[PDB]
mmCIF file of C-alpha atoms and ligand atoms in Angstrom:
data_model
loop_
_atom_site.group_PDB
_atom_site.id
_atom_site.type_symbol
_atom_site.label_atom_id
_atom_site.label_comp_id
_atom_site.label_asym_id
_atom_site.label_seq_id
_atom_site.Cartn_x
_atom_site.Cartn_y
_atom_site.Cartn_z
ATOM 1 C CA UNK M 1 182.943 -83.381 0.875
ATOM 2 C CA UNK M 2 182.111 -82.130 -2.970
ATOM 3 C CA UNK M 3 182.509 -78.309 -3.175
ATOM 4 C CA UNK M 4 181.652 -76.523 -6.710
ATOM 5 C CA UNK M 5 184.403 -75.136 -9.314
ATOM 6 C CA UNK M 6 184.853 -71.746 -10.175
ATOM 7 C CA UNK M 7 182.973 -70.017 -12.683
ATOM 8 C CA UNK M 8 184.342 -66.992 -13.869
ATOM 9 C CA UNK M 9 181.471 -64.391 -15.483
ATOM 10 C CA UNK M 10 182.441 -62.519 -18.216
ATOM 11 C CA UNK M 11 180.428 -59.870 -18.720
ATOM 12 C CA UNK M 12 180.991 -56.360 -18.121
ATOM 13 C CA UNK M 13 180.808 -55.838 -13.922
ATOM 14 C CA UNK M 14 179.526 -52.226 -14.388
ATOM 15 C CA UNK M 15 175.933 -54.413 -15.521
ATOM 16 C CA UNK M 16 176.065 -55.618 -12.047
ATOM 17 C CA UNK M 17 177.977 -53.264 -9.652
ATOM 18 C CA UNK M 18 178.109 -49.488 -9.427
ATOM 19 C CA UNK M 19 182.356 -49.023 -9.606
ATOM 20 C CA UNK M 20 183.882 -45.656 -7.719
ATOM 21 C CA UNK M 21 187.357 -44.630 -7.593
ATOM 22 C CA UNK M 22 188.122 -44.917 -4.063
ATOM 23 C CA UNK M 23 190.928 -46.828 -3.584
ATOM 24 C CA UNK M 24 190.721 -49.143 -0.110
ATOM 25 C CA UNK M 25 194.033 -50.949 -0.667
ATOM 26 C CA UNK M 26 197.484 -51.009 -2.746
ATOM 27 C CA UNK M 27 197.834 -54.725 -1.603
ATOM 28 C CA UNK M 28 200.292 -57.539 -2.585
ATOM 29 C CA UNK M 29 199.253 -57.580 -6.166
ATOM 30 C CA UNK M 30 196.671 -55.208 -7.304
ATOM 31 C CA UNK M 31 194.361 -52.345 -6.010
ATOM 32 C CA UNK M 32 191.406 -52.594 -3.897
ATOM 33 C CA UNK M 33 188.318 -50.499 -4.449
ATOM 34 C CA UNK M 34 185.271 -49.772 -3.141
ATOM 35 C CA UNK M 35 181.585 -50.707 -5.015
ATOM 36 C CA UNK M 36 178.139 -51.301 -4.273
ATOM 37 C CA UNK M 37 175.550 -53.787 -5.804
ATOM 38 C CA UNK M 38 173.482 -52.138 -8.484
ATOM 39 C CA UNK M 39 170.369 -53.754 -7.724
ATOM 40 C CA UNK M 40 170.786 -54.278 -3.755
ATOM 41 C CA UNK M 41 172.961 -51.179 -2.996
ATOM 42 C CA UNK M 42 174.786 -53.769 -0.358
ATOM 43 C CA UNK M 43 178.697 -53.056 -0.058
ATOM 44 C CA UNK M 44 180.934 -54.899 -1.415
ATOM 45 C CA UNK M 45 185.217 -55.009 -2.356
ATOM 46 C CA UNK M 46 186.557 -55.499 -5.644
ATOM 47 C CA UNK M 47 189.934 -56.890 -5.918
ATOM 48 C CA UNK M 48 191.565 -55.834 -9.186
ATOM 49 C CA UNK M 49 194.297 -58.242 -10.909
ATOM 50 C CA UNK M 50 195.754 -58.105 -14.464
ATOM 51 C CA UNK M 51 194.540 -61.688 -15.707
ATOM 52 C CA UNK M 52 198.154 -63.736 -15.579
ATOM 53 C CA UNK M 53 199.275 -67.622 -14.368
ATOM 54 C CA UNK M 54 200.163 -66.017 -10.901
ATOM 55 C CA UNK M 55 196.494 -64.065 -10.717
ATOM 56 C CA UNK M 56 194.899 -67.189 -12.154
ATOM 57 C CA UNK M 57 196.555 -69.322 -9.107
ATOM 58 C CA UNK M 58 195.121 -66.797 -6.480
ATOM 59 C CA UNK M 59 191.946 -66.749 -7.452
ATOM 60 C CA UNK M 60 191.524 -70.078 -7.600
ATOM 61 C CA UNK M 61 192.930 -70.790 -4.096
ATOM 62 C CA UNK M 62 191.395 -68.287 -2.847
ATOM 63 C CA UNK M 63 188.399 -69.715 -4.255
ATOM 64 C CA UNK M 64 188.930 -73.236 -2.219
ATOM 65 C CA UNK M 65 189.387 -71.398 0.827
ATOM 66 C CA UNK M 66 186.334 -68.940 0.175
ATOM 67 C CA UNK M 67 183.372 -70.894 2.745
ATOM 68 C CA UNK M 68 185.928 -70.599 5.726
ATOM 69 C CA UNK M 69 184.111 -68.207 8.482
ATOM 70 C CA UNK M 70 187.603 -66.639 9.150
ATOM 71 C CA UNK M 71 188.591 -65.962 5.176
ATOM 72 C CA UNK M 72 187.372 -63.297 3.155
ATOM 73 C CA UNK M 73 184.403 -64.430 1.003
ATOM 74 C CA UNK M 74 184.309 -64.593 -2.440
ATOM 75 C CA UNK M 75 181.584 -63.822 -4.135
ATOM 76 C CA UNK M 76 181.919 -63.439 -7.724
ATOM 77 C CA UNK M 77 184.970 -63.310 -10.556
ATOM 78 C CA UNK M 78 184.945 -61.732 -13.733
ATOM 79 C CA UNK M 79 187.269 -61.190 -16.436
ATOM 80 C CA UNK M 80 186.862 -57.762 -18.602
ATOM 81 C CA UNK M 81 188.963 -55.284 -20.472
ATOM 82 C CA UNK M 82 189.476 -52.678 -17.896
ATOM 83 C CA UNK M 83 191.384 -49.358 -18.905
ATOM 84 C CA UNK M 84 192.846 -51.410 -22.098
ATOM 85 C CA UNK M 85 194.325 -54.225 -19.854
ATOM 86 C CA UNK M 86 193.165 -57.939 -18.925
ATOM 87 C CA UNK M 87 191.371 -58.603 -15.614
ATOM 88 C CA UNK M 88 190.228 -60.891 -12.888
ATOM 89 C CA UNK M 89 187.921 -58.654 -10.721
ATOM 90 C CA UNK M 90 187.093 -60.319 -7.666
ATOM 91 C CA UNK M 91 184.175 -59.176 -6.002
ATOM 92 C CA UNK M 92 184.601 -59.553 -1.983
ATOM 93 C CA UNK M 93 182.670 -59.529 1.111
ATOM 94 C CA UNK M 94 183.203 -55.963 2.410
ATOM 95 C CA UNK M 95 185.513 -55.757 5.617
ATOM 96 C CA UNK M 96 184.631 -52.455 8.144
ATOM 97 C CA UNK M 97 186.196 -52.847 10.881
ATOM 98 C CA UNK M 98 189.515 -51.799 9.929
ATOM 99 C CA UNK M 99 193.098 -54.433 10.746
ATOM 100 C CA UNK M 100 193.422 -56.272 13.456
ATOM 101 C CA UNK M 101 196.139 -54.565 15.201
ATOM 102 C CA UNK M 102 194.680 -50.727 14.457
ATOM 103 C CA UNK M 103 191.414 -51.799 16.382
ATOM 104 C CA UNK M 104 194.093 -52.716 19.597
ATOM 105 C CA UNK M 105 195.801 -50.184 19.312
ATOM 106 C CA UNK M 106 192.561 -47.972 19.809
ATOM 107 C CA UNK M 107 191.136 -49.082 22.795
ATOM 108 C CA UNK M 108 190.040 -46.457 24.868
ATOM 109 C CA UNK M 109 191.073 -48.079 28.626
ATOM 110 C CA UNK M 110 193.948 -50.303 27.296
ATOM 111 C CA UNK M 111 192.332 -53.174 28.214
ATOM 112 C CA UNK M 112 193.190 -56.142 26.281
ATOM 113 C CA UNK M 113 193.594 -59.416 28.059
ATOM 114 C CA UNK M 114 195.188 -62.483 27.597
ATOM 115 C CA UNK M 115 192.158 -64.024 27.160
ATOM 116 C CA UNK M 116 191.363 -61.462 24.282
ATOM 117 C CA UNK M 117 194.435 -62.694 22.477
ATOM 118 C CA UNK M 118 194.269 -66.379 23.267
ATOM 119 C CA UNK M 119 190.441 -65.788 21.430
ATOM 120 C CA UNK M 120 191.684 -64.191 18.308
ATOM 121 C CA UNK M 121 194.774 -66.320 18.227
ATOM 122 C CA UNK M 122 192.316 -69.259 18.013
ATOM 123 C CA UNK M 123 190.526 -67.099 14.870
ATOM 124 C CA UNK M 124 193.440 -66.979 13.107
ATOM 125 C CA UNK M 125 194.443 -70.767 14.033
ATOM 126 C CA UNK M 126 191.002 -72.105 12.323
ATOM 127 C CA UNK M 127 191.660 -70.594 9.123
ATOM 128 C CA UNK M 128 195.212 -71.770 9.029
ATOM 129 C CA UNK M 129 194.263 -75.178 9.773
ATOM 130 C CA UNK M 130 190.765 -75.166 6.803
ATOM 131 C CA UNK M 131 193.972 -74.138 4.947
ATOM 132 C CA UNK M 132 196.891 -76.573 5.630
ATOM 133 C CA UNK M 133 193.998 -79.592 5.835
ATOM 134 C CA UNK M 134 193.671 -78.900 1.569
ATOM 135 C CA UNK M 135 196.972 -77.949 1.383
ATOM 136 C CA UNK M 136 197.398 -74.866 1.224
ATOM 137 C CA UNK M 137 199.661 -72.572 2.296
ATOM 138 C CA UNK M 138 198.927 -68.771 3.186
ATOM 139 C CA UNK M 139 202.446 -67.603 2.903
ATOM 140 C CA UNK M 140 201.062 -64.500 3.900
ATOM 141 C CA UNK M 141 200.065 -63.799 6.824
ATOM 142 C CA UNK M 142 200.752 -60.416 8.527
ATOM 143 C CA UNK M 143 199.123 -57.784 10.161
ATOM 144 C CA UNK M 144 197.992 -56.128 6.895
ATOM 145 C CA UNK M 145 196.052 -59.033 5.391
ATOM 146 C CA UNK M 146 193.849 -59.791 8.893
ATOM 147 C CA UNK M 147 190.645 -57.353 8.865
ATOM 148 C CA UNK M 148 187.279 -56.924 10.972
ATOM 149 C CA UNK M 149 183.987 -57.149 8.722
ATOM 150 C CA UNK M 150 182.123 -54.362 10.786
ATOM 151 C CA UNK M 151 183.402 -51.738 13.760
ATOM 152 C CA UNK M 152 180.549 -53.922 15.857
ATOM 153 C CA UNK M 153 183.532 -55.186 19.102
ATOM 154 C CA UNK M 154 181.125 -58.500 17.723
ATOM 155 C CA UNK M 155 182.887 -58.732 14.461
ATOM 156 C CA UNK M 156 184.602 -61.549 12.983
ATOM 157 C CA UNK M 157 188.052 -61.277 12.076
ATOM 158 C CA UNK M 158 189.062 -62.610 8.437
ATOM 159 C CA UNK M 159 192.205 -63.081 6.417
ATOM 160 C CA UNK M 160 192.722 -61.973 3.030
ATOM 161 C CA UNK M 161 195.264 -62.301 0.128
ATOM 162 C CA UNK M 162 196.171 -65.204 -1.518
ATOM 163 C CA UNK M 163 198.632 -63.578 -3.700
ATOM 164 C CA UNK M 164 201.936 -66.220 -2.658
ATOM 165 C CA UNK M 165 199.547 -68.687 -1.298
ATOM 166 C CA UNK M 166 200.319 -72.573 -2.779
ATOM 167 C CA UNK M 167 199.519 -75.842 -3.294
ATOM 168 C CA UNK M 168 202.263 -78.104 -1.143
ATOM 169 C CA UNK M 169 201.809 -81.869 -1.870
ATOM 170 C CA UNK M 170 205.135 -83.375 -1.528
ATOM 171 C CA UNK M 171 206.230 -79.869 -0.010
ATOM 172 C CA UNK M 172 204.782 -80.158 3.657
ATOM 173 C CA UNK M 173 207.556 -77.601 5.378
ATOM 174 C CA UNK M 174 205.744 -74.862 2.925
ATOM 175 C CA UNK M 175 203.499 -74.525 5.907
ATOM 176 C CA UNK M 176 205.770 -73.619 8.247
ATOM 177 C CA UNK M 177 205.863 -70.380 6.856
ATOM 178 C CA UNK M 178 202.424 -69.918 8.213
ATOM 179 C CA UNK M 179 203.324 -71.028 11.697
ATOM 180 C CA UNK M 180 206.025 -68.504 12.124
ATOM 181 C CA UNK M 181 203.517 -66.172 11.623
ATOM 182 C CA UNK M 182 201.520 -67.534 13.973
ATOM 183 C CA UNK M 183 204.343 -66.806 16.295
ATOM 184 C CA UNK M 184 204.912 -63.318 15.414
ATOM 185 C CA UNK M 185 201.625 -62.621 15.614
ATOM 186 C CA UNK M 186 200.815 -64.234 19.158
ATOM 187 C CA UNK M 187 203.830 -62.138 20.389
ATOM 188 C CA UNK M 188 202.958 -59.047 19.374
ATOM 189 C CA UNK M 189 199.254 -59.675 20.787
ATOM 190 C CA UNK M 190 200.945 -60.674 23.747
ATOM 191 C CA UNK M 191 203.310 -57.263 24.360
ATOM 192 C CA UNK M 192 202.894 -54.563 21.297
ATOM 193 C CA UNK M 193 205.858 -55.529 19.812
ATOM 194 C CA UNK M 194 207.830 -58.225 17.029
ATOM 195 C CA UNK M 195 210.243 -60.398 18.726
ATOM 196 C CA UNK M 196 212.593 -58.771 16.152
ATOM 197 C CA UNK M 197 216.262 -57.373 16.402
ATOM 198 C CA UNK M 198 217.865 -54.070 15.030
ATOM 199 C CA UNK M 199 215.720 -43.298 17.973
ATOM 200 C CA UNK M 200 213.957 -40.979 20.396
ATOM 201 C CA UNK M 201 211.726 -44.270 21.626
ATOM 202 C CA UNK M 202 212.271 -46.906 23.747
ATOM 203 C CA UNK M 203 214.208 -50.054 22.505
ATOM 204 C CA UNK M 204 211.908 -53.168 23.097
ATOM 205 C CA UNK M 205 214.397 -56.176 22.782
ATOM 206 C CA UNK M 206 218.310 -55.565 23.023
ATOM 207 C CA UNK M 207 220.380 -57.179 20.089
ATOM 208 C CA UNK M 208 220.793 -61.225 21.343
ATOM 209 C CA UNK M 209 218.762 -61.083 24.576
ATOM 210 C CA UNK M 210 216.568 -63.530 25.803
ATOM 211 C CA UNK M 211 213.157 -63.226 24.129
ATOM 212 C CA UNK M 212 210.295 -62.358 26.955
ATOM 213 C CA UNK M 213 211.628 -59.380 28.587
ATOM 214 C CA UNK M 214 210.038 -58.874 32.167
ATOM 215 C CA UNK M 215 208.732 -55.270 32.287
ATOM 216 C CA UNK M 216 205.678 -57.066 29.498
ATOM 217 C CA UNK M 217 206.344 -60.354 30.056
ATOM 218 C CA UNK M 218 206.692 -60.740 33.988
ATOM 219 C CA UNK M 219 203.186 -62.303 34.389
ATOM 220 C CA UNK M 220 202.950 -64.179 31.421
ATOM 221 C CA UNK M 221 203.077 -67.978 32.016
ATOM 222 C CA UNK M 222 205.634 -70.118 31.134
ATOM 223 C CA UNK M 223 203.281 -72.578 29.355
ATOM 224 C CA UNK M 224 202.416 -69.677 27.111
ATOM 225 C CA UNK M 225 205.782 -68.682 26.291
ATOM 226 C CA UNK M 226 206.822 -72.700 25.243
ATOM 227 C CA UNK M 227 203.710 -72.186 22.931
ATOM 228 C CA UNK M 228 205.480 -69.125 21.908
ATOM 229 C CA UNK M 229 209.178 -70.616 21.179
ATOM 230 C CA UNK M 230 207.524 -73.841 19.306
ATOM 231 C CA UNK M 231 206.081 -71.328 16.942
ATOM 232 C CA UNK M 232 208.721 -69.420 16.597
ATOM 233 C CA UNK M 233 211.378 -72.352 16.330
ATOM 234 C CA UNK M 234 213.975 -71.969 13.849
ATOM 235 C CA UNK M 235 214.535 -75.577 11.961
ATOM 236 C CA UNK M 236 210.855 -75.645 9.817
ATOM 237 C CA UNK M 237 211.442 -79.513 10.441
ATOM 238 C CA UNK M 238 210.637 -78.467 14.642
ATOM 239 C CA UNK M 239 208.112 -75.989 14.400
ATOM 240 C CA UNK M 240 205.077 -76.686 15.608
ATOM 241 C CA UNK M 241 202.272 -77.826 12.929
ATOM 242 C CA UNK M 242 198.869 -76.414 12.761
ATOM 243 C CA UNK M 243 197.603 -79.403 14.419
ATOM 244 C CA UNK M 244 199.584 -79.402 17.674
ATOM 245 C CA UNK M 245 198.625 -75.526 17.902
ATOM 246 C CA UNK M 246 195.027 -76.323 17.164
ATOM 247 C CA UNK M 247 194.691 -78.764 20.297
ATOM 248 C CA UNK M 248 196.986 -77.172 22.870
ATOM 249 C CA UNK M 249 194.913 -75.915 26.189
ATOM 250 C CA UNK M 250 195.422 -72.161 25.539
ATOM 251 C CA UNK M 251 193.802 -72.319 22.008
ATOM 252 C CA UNK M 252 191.165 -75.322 22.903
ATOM 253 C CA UNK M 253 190.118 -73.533 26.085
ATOM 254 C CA UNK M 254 190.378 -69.701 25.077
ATOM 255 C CA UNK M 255 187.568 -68.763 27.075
ATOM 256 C CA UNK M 256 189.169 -70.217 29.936
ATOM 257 C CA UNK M 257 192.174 -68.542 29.955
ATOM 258 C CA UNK M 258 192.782 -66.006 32.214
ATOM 259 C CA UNK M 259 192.035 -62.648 31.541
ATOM 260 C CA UNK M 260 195.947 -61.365 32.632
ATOM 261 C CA UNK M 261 195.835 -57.793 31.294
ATOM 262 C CA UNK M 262 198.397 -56.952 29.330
ATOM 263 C CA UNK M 263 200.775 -54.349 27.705
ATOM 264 C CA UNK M 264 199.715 -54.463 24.197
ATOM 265 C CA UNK M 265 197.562 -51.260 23.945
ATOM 266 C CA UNK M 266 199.566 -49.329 25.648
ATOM 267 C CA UNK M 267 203.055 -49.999 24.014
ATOM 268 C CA UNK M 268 200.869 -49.773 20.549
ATOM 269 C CA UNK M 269 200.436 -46.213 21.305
ATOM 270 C CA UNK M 270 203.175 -45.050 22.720
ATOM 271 C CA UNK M 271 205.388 -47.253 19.753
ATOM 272 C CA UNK M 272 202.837 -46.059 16.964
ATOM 273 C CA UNK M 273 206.262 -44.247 14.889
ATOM 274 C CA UNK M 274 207.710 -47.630 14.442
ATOM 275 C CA UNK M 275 204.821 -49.350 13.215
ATOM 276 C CA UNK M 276 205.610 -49.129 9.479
ATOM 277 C CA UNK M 277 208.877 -50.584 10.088
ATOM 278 C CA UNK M 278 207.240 -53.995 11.952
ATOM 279 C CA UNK M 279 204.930 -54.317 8.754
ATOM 280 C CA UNK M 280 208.014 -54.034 6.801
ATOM 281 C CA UNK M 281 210.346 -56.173 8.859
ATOM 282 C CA UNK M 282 208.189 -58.720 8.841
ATOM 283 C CA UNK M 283 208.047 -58.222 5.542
ATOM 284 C CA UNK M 284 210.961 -58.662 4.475
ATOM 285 C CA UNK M 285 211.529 -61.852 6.889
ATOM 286 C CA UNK M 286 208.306 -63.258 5.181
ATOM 287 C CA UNK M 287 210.445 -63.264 1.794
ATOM 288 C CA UNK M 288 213.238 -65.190 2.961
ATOM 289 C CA UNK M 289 211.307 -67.509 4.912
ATOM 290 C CA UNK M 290 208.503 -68.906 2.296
HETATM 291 N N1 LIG L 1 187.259 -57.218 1.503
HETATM 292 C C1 LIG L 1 187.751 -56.053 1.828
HETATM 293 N N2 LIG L 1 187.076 -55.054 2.249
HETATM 294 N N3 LIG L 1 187.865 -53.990 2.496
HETATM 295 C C2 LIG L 1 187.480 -52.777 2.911
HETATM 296 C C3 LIG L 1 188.286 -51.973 3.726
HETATM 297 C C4 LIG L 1 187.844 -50.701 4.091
HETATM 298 C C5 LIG L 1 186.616 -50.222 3.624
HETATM 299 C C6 LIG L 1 185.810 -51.017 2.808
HETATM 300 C C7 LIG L 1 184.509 -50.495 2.299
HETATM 301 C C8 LIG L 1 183.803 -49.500 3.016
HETATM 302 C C9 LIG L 1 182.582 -48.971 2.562
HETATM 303 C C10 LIG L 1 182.114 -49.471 1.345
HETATM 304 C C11 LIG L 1 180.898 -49.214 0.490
HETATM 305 C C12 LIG L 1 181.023 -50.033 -0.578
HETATM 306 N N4 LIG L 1 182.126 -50.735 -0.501
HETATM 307 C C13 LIG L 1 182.810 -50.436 0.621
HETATM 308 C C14 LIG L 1 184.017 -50.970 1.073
HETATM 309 C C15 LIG L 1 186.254 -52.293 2.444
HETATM 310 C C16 LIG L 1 189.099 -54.310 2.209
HETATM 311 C C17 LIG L 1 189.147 -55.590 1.821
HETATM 312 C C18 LIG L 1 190.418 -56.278 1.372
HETATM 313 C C19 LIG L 1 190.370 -57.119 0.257
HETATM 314 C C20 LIG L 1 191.520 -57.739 -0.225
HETATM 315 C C21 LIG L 1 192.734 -57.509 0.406
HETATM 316 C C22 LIG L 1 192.790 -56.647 1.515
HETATM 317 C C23 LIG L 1 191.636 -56.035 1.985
HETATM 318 C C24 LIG L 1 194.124 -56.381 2.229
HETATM 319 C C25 LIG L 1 195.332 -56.567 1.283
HETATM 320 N N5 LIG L 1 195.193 -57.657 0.318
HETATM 321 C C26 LIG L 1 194.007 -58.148 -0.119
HETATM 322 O O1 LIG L 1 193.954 -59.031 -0.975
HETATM 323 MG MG1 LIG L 2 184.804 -67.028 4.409
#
């Protein structure tokens, strides 16, 4: 299994790509724009960080990860002098079909299904596991960072940003952080909103009270909610690893699940306000749990 090393070009990217202003992104560590191939006119996403040890480490795990179907490619990295500063531009496959969770919240009938979330759950699952089987950790994995390539309801979903992903020999329980999100990330998929604690909207979960609560969870299974609390388990050293989640029946047989429809749309709508805060509890619990 012999992959090849990065090669970083280093001449200008405006010989190659036609650059625009547009911004498509503030994310975790630089700005992401929009640009088009000079000679092809195909679409394409430049990733801009200011060359450093931390950018260097990004791009070159992001680099390892690049040929999974469910991260976003990589398809070329320069270094240049951009507006009198050092950079890595990283040239990207371009992603459409807006974030996962915007697309749900759109759908015109409000029909999502278990099934629907047991399939993307799966999604996310592979690239986790191309990750943890090199050793990586994400670290990041939210909401934000997991994008459609096209608006096509065919369109693969991908994660992005490998801004606190690491290396974890001899640090295994690194990867639990990725789990946990796992968690999060099922549950929302599962209702429309974080099993999170805390004005003129409905209050999801009360302060302390058991997890699942029955006007969105009532016909969820049980099976599905142990899934759920193994994810989500406190002590790193009894979450469940990639592997487990990779072979249990609800991933392995997603299209065999049954299609239970579900809350999500719905409470996405109605609980739009609050979304910012989710991204930003999470967050914030992402910080102290890496
Ligand atoms: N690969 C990508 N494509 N788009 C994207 C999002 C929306 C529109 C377009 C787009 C749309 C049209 C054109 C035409 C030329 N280029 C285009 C690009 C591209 C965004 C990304 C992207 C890349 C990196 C990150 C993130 C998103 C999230 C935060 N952190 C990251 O590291
Ligand atoms: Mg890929």
């Amino acid at each position: 299994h012999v992959k090849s090393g990065l090669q970083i070009k280093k001449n200008a990217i405006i010989d190659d790509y036609k650059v625009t202003s547009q911004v498509l992104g503030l994310g975790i560590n630089g700005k992401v724009l929009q640009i088009f191939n000079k000679r092809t006119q195909e679409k394409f996403a430049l990733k801009m960080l200011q060359d450093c040890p931390k950018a260097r480490r990004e791009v070159e795990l992001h680099w390892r990860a690049s040929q999974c179907p469910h991260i976003v490619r990589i398809v070329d990295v320069y270094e240049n002098l951009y507006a009198g500063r050092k950079c890595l531009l990283i040239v990207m496959e371009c992603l459409d079909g807006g974030e996962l969770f915007s697309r749900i919240q759109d759908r015109g009938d409000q029909a999502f299904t278990e099934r629907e979330a047991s399939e993307i759950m799966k999604s996310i699952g592979e690239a986790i596991q191309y990750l943890h089987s090199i050793n990586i950790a994400h670290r990041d994995v939210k909401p934000e960072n997991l994008l459609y390539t096209s608006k096509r309801p065919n369109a693969i979903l991908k994660l992005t940003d490998f801004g606190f992903a690491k290396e974890t020999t001899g640090e295994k329980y690194d990867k639990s952080c990725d789990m946990w999100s796992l968690g999060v990330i099922m549950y929302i998929l599962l209702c429309g909103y974080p099993p999170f604690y805390s004005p003129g909207m409905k209050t999801r979960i009360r302060m302390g009270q058991y997890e699942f609560p029955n006007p969105e969870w009532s016909e969820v299974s049980e099976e599905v909610k142990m899934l759920i609390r193994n994810l989500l388990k406190t002590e790193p050293t009894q979450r469940m690893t990639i592997t487990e989640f990779m072979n249990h029946p609800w991933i392995m047989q997603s299209t065999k699940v049954p299609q239970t429809p579900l809350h999500t749309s719905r409470v996405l709508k109605e609980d739009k306000e609050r979304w910012e805060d989710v991204k930003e509890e999470m967050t914030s619990a992402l910080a102290t749990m890496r």
